């Protein structure tokens, strides 16, 4: 037993020193909220991270992008008119140029944002303890097609993904925040007579502006109806199921301007408040 008495003290020190350290780390892990970015290709995921991070080689990289853009235009002024037929890639200069984890703090609150990183989607089962999921789509790319198959509408492609994510067994108690990006491009495209929205979507012909709307005073009537049509389609899938454990928060934003005046913080506050308020038997 003499040998054990000498040995036991060491295992006690290690268990102790380690146990005290792990107890301290619990507070850091508990007082941290994680966010996930999802969406379709060529949507603007990096630009949103760039805007949030705002709270040399890049110039050369932008120059390389300009050379590639010039070559693309050469292969295609009149060529830019038919830019919808063929695939084309679109502070202020930083956003224009084309696992990434970014940590930022707002109002003495620690937040964690990690990028997505592939149609198997098997890694999605790992993110089962995330506060919210950020889902980004392009609202001004209905007359476009994904490169891999030319038979599928770029926009319809995005929804087919939202329904799969929404109707997932693992993500049964995770809220979704919706960002309808590329709003500026939509306004210019709709004003032009060419490329009518009704041509691709037959349901827009019978659509009417909802009574409960709030168009910016500046915006023309035609645009508002169009804008609200995209949001209505997305919310139809979300409201189908959920049973009170799922909530979607649509928004309209342009990646160029910093309209994000702490709105992510406000939305996360509401989500956590609702989680607490429905955690009780009834409230």
């Amino acid at each position: 037993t003499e040998d054990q008495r000498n040995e036991e003290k060491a295992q006690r020190e290690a268990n102790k020193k380690i146990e005290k350290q792990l107890q301290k780390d619990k507070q850091v892990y508990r007082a941290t909220h994680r966010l996930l970015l999802l969406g379709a290709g060529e949507s603007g995921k990096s630009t949103i991270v760039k805007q949030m991070r705002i709270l040399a080689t890049k110039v050369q990289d932008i120059k390389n992008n300009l050379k590639e853009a010039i070559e693309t235009i050469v292969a295609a002024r009149a060529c830019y008119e038919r830019s919808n037929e063929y695939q084309l890639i679109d502070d202020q200069d930083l956003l224009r140029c084309r696992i990434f984890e970014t940590k930022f703090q707002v109002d003495k609150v620690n937040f964690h944002m990690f990028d997505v990183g592939d149609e198997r989607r098997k890694w999605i089962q790992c993110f089962n303890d995330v506060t919210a999921i950020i889902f980004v789509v392009a609202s001004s790319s209905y007359n476009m097609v994904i490169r891999e198959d030319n038979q599928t509408n770029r926009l319809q492609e995005a929804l087919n993904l939202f329904k799969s994510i929404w109707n997932n067994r693992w993500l049964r108690t995770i809220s979704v925040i919706l960002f309808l990006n590329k709003q500026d491009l939509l306004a210019e495209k709709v004003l032009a007579g060419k490329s009518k929205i009704e041509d691709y979507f037959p349901e827009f012909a019978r659509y009417t502006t909802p009574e409960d709307a709030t168009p910016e005073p500046g915006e023309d009537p035609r645009v508002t109806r169009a804008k609200y049509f995209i949001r209505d389609e997305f919310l139809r899938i979300s409201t189908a199921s959920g049973d009170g454990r799922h909530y979607c928060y649509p928004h309209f934003t342009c990646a160029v301007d910093t309209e994000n005046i702490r709105r992510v913080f406000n939305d996360c506050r509401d989500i956590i408040q609702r989680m607490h308020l429905r955690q009780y038997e009834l409230l």
Binding site: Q11, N15, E19, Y29, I99, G117, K122, W123, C126, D129
Partner: protein, 337 residues
């Protein structure tokens, strides 16, 4: 290209005829004489706590006394089953970890995850500080499993439908394995460390060669993604994990399916499988909050292990067959005997 494609279909027809001609009778007919095992009930002996999040990986040591567990919290903790005392706590650069290993010599621990990089750590360091030794970074896709052949070799499997054999001294892939059309999720070496299998997501299992680097036998018929795989102690068989709550046992020499383990009341998935010392019990986890113990030669349930509050994501059996350890997603390790 039609002639080449049609030639492939010609080969498949010959394989089926040869396999069918080599089926004298089913295994269940031969093994009907043996007596049933009965009812086996094991009680929890030790409970291991101290993890902050869900747990994905687990692996025993050569001494069958030390085990390592990996969790999404970013900590790699080495325990001590006999006295329930932590020995090390290695921090990780990436918070997403999906696998871990343990050296036969007990001097190195590996890790990997969504970072697409396999990391190796040193234990018996000079000056007593754990520290990254090598960072194998040339690869694509998230890793799934890692195993040690010796102190200088390691095999890895990832989601880019490829498997590779690494070299710690140079940090370069000595050889690469190709042929799978889906994500590779599990692997297991043979006791002779000369052959190893790998179950992909395309409902197929292959038996590779370490020295040659070419496929030898491709099994089939699972009908869903394989999520775990083990290997028989005798060295001539291996069982496969399943999405469809079905475990299938294959034979290398016969190149045929022997039995299928299933039950009517189960519709959940399978996460981990393992064998016993004598190759009689086929322990396996489940997605329905507990584990069930099967009979290798009878396909009859012989006990239920329901001491967990969440899904089971790992399982292991000691080399000497003394105890069974199972993890979960609720940050609790349990040791059964």
């Amino acid at each position: 290209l039609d002639q080449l494609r049609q030639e492939a279909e010609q080969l498949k027809n010959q394989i089926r005829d040869a396999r069918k001609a080599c089926a004298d009778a089913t295994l269940s007919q031969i093994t009907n004489n043996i007596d049933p095992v009965g009812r086996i009930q094991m009680r929890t002996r030790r409970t291991l706590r101290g993890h902050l999040a869900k747990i994905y990986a687990m692996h025993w040591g050569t001494d069958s006394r030390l085990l390592v567990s990996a969790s999404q919290d970013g900590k790699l903790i080495i325990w001590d089953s006999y006295t329930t005392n932590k020995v090390h706590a290695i921090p990780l650069r990436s918070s997403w970890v999906m696998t871990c290993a343990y050296a036969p010599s007990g001097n190195y621990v590996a890790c990997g995850g969504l970072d697409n990089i396999c990391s190796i750590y040193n234990l018996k360091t000079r000056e007593g500080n754990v520290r990254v030794s090598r960072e194998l970074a040339g690869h694509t896709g998230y890793l799934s499993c890692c195993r040690f052949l010796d102190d200088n070799q390691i095999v890895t499997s990832s989601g880019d439908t490829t498997c590779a054999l690494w070299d710690i001294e140079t940090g370069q892939q000595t050889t690469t394995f190709t042929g799978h059309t889906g994500d590779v999720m599990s692997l297991s070496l043979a006791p002779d460390t000369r052959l190893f299998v790998s179950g992909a997501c395309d409902a197929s299992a292959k038996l590779w060669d370490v020295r040659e680097g070419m496929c030898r036998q491709t099994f089939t018929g699972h009908e869903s993604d394989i999520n775990a795989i083990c290997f028989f102690p005798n060295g001539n068989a291996f069982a496969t994990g399943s999405d469809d709550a079905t475990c299938r046992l294959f034979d290398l020499r016969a190149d045929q399916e022997l039995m299928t383990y299933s039950h009517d009341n189960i519709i959940c998935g399978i996460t981990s499988v393992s064998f016993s010392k004598s190759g009689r019990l086929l322990l396996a986890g489940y997605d329905d909050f507990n584990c069930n113990v099967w009979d290798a030669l009878k396909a009859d349930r012989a006990g239920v292990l329901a001491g967990h509050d969440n899904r089971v994501s790992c399982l292991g059996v000691t080399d000497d067959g003394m105890a069974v350890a199972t993890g979960s997603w609720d940050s609790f390790l349990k040791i059964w005997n």
